[PDB]
């Protein structure tokens, strides 16, 4: 009675009767995802129905993660959780899990290859920084960010849309399978950064393989002081490459792209860094000139079986 | 100061 069900492709969505006029956005592998118009709100909502949540051990833990993180993490440029439900009525038939969340205008796909200036231009980076520095403070590294999960509305607001891991934009000691820190986000705030000015993907591999070579390529070789880091069986494949001299930022982001300037010119310097540890950091980059602009500090600062799991996320949603 | 209030997409 408080449920009806609409067909959304080969999927049924069963919702609470507040959702409304269902029409599908996109697909992930998480699951498929309808704007909808929540009338108690009076507003449109994204709602997520999970894919098959225990289906098996890695499902179940990965929608158990999303749902509790989800629920603890709180802030103006992430993506927030509006509700939770499941149509089944008991823990034996529990089977389907529904999200609501916030639904924007875009993903940073369709912004990213138009004419954005300066003002535009900063004014989005600082909020992705302002999110990535949130999701930070809660101990999530996102290590995944791309345009395609950062989203954006008409007003020029901004939200990342979730929580990452656990190829183009990936930081190197991601590829090569090194430790990273903090700033393994920063690389790929470089790379989206970088996008928004040449007008397209800066190190588009085809494989993996291409695609340290294509960094390498335009950055230059890592000094030693970085292959002495790494791996052996790596190490050595890292090292018998050919050596690649690197260009230069004025080279790789020349005068002729831009509409400040030399500003988002000297922060990419700093962000499109191999070697991390001498890569800028969030708190650094937030304060840089080509950011600082816009500051305001109220927004700048286990195994189980899948029964087990299955009673775990059942919690999570009552 | 005034930060952007549009956005074209
Ligand atoms: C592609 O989806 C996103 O980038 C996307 C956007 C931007 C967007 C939001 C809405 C639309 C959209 O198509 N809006 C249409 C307008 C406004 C209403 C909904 C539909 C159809 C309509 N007639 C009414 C016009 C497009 C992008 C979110 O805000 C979003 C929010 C929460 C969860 N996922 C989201 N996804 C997404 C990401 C990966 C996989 C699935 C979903």
Same mark, same amino acid.
């Given at each position: ?138 101990? $999530? ?26 190829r183009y934009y990936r930081a190197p000691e991601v590829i090569l399978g090194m ?6 986000? $920063?690389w790929?705030?470089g790379c989206?950064?970088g996008?928004?000015?040449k007008?397209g993907v800066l190190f588009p591999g085809t494989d993996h393989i291409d695609q340290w070579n294509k960094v390498i390529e335009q950055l230059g070789t890592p000094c030693?002081?970085f292959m002495?880091?790494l791996?052996?069986?790596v190490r050595t494949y890292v090292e018998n490459r050919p050596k690649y001299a690197g260009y230069?930022?004025?080279k790789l ?19 499109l860094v191999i070697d991390?540890?001498?890569? $800028? ?9 080509? $950011? ?27 | ?9």
């Amino acid at each position: 009675n408080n449920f009806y069900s609409v067909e959304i492709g080969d999927s049924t969505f069963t919702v609470l009767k507040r959702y409304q006029n269902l029409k599908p956005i996109g697909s992930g592998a998480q699951g498929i995802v309808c704007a909808a118009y929540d009338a108690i709100l009076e507003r449109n909502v994204a709602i997520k129905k999970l894919s098959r949540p225990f289906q098996n051990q890695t499902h179940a833990k990965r929608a158990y993660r999303e749902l509790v993180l989800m629920k603890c993490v709180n802030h103006k440029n992430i993506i927030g959780l509006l509700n939770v439900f499941t149509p089944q009525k008991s823990l034996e038939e529990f089977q389907d899990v529904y999200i609501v969340m916030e639904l924007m205008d875009a993903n940073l796909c369709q912004v990213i290859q138009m004419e954005l200036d300066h003002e535009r231009m900063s004014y989005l980076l600082y909020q992705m920084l302002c999110g990535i520095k949130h999701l930070h403070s809660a101990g $999530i590294i996102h290590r995944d960010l791309k345009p395609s999960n950062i989203v954006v509305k008409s007003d020029c607001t901004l939200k990342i849309l979730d929580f990452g891991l656990a190829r183009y934009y990936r930081a190197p000691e991601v590829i090569l399978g090194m430790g990273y820190k903090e700033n393994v986000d $920063i690389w790929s705030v470089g790379c989206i950064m970088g996008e928004m000015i040449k007008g397209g993907v800066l190190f588009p591999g085809t494989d993996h393989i291409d695609q340290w070579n294509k960094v390498i390529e335009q950055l230059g070789t890592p000094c030693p002081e970085f292959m002495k880091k790494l791996q052996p069986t790596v190490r050595t494949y890292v090292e018998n490459r050919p050596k690649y001299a690197g260009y230069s930022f004025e080279k790789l982001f020349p005068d002729v792209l831009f509409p400040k300037a030399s500003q988002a010119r000297d922060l990419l310097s700093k962000m499109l860094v191999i070697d991390a540890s001498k890569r $800028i950091s969030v708190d650094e980059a937030l304060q840089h000139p080509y $950011i600082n602009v816009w500051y305001d500090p109220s927004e700048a600062e286990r195994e189980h079986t899948i029964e087990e799991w299955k009673e775990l996320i059942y919690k999570e949603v009552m | 100061p005034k930060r952007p209030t549009t956005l074209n997409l």
